[PDB]
Amino acid sequence: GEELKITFILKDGSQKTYEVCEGETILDIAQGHNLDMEGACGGSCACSTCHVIVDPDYYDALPEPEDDENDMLDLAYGLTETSRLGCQIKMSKDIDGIRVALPQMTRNVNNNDFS
Numbered sequence: 001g002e003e004l005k006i007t008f009i010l011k012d013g014s015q016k017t018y019e020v021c022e023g024e025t026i027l028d029i030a031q032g033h034n035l036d037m038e039g040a041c042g043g044s045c046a047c048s049t050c051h052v053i054v055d056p057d058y059y060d061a062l063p064e065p066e067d068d069e070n071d072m073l074d075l076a077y078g079l080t081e082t083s084r085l086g087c088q089i090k091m092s093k094d095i096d097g098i099r100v101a102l103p104q105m106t107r108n109v110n111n112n113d114f115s
C-alpha cells in the first residue's frame with residue numbers, strides 16, 4: 001500500500017520512528033506501541049492523558065480543541081505553540097514523515113498499574 005510513519009520524541013529525549021496506517025491516533029500509537037513513556041489512557045476507562053506537541057510543519061494544517069479538551073494537554077509539563085490532542089488527531093496522506101514530542105507527565109494516579 002501507500003505506507004506512512006510517525007516520529008515521537010521520548011520522555012527520555014530519544015527519537016523513535018514507527019511505521020503505521022492511516023486513521024491511527026497519536027496517543028493510540030504512543031501507548032498502543034508502548035513507547036518508553038508516561039501516560040494511562042490505554043487502561044480500562046482511563047482516558048485523560050491526551051498530551052502531545054507537533055512539528056510546526058505538520059501543525060500548520062491542524063485544528064484547535066475545546067477548553068476541556070486542551071486542558072488534557074496542560075496536565076503535561078511545558079505546553080507549546082504547537083500542542084496537539086492525542087485522541088483528536090490522526091494519520092492522513094499529508095502526515096507522511098510527521099513528528100510529535102511526548103512531554104513529561106505530572107500525575108495519573110494508578111498506584112500499581114493501568115494495564
Ligand code: FES
Pocket residue numbers: 027028041046047048049050072085086087088
Ligand atoms: S488520548 Fe485519552 S484523553 Fe485523549
